[PDB]
Symmetry: D2
Subunit: 116 residues, 4 copies
Amino acid sequence: CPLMVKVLDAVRGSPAINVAVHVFRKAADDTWEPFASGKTSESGELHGLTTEEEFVEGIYKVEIDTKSYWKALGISPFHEHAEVVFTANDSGPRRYTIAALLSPYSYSTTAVVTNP
Amino acid sequence: CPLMVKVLDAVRGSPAINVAVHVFRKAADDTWEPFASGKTSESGELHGLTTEEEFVEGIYKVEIDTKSYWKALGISPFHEHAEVVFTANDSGPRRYTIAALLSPYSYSTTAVVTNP
Amino acid sequence: CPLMVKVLDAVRGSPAINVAVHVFRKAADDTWEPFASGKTSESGELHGLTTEEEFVEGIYKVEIDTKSYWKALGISPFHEHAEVVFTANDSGPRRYTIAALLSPYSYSTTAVVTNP
Amino acid sequence: CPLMVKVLDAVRGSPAINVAVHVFRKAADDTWEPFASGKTSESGELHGLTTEEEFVEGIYKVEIDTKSYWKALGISPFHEHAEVVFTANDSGPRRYTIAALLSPYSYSTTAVVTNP
Ligand SMILES: Oc1cc(O)cc(/C=C/c2ccc(O)cc2Cl)c1
Ligand SMILES: Oc1cc(O)cc(/C=C/c2ccc(O)cc2Cl)c1
């Protein structure tokens, strides 16, 4: 899988389930153009965002709707959402995992980048 | 101080020094309007962004230029930058500290919110 | 898998490979008694630590040798190692994932706890 | 201050107040010998652990009683506590800040190490 997103929950110690995720790619004129979207599964993961064909060198933005996740749980959190912006594939094709660990007032993100 | 930003560096175990920071506030028409900016000091901190007078109820965006920090150090990092989006003062005036801990492929952010 | 350990690397954005892990369980006399050990695979993961039979209610300690990982890479890190201490199965059998994200001067740990 | 400890709370977005902290130093025979202790103040901080005189080159262990903090708040957390083990002053005297960000099922720690 060229690109995958995992969301964990640090308050309950569980996967973050059914979290909406939106991906954008910067167009050649400096505008954000819609690239993919989905909701996280039961194990906090979202696969099949894209293919190796269409996942070319570029700047991408991953937006995770953290606010909606917390409210659905009865919690009013701090952040409107969490976004990860990064250059991809600028040194040949890699497989990417964007992970995020969430709390109401904090979040952490990391990327796992491997050569297939 | 109504609003303050601290940046730490997890690779060297030090403050993140001279990091550019930009703050925006959402205008009544859903556009991001420039609110404040600065660079972090020697202790990784940025004070005097605003005053209690002008820091009213609203949605704010704090953008930290992580990429430029790493490059100035001879490192090519993963993220273009880091941004924190949050509602402020929706329950009366609070003092806010936005903290970020950085690594080339990861970052963590939290908010310390206190009642003065 | 009743218990599994994943180690990621935040400086290179990759799995932490071949990291030694030791697990202890507190004995009925308040002493740490050896329970299991292993090294992380290529995807930063360590499976087959134990079985559901022997993984009973108790206090466990997971020790990750972070120091040795960094040195093998040519880095002198801050911590001697990282340890996670937790009660397990005190409310019936759960599956546990202990995750750790590492940098030379920082680390983060979380647990994913699910009901099978 | 040669050594200081700060504890933050990621569920409430506040300092972690009145958290017990214990420091040990490894003795020349490989045993942990009691070095200092305290409770965090209202701003989540614990100062005056030691002096530059007695804070010599060595391996130290900082133990933060996270469990007691959460229970006092009406929360049953995952970890028994959090401990940071590190070598100090092996390259001349430094000032150390050990920071920890806590959630019931997760915690993060970093060190800020500066040359005075
Ligand atoms: O690919 C995987 C799988 C998993 O089961 C957990 C993680 C956890 C990552 C993590 C992220 C941010 C942070 O602050 C701490 C951690 Cl441990 C990643
Ligand atoms: O106000 C202060 C002062 C300080 O000296 C350190 C911190 C550290 C915060 C922190 C942030 C993110 C993370 O993942 C871990 C931590 Cl410990 C905050």
